[model samples]
Target chain A: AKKDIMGDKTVRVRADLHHIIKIETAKNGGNVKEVMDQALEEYIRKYLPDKL
Target chain B: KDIMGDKTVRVRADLHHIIKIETAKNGGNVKEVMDQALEEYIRKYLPDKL
Candidate 1:
């Protein structure tokens, strides 16, 4: 559904964290990209307030 | 050169979820799966470009 959108960029990740994300999605249920976005958002909110 | 080089990167959570689910369902480790994914992505998009 989200084939196209603004701020959409291809990202590469390490295998370790990638594994965790996959496990997280399997335990829950949702789109991986959405899941990743939320995580990053939360991180920024916590660590990089200036950016937000 | 290998696109999936020996390096760590940050990604979104949603993508991570898909990887975990598939890895658990199937068998093998994340590196292997990620490598496969990169290869597939390259194959699909880059095709002759790579």
Candidate 2:
């Protein structure tokens, strides 16, 4: 279920990045949280290989 | 150019710790890492329209 995978902690981010996330979410049809998760996940995959 | 302004977002607790620790080890901060991550996300996922 969605609740199982939903994140509960918060972090600060640049305003521009936040704006872009909203735009991306609007364009792609998911919520802002989903886009944020997608971005973070990809970042970990590309830059933090040891974590995987 | 008020680049210092910021906002908060909810994310995975574990992922947040990873970002914090890695950034600290590299002498950076969570906000900068998130900025770079989001930028890369835009480059890879967004259309040229952006």
Candidate 3:
């Protein structure tokens, strides 16, 4: 899931595509490209990743 | 998709199948009943808990 073949331990994961997919920019400079996007990734559609 | 380190998560799918056999699938269609049960399970076990 890395953007480049070589990177650190963390990977850049865009939270949602159709909206502001927030990242901890202190995550080494990940700027959410848009505040509101429509083509949100299906993987993130209503995706609530809470643990059981 | 590069060769990299990743975290592996494991669950007992067979045990889940056994549970399904002991619970829903045995009583009726596994897909139909299990889907409904999964919805209820989300509510009963995971709604607020999650």
Candidate 4:
């Protein structure tokens, strides 16, 4: 069965990285979720060879 | 612009540790490590794409 594109998964990081992400997001007026989303999409695209 | 939404995902603790370490070693963010690793995985799995 094909996996749902909308299906999201989670990864945990050290508290320091977690804090850093929060700071980076706040500094740029960006949302952490979106950063994660872009990161994940970029990661997926690296292998998929399919333009997002 | 970015928006935060509610969602949940779970991963092993050790994997996350490796990601963090890789990010630090590469002097990049977590996302960068993810991107690099994914690219390598793809190249390994799908060599013709390159």
Give the best candidate by lDDT: 1
Badly placed stretches (over 4 Å) of model 2 are A1-52, B2-4, B47-49
lDDT of 1 by residue, A1-52 (tens): 3334546766887878776776666777765688778888899899997886
Give model 2's TM-score versus the native structure: 0.43
Which residue pairs show backbone clashes in model 2?
none
- The Cα error of candidate 3 at residue A28, in Å, is 53
- Please, what are the lDDT tens digits per residue for candidate 2 over residues A1-52? 5547765767788977776665555444566677777788899899997876
Clashing pairs in 3: A18-A37, A24-A27
Q: By the TM-score metric, which is better: model 2 or model 4?
A: 2
Give lDDT tens digits, candidate 2, residues B1-50.
Answer: 67577788888978877775565444566788888888888889985746
Which 10-residue window of candidate 4 chain A scores lowest in summed lDDT?
Answer: A1-10
lDDT of 3 by residue, A1-52 (tens): 4335754343355445312333222122334432222223433455743411
Tell me the alpha-carbon RMSD of every candidate: 12.5, 17.8, 19.2, 18.9
Query: B1, model 3: CA deviation in Å?
Result: 38
lDDT of 4 by residue, B1-50 (tens): 26644334456767866665555444677655666666799899997887
**A14: Cα error in model 3, Å:** 56
Q: Candidates 1 and 2: which is better by lDDT?
A: 1
What DockQ would you assign to candidate 3? 0.01
- State the lDDT of candidate 1 residue by residue for B1-50, as single tens digits: 45535666676778876776777666765677777788899999998967
Between candidates 3 and 4, the DockQ winner: 4
Q: What is the TM-score of chain B in candidate 3?
A: 0.34
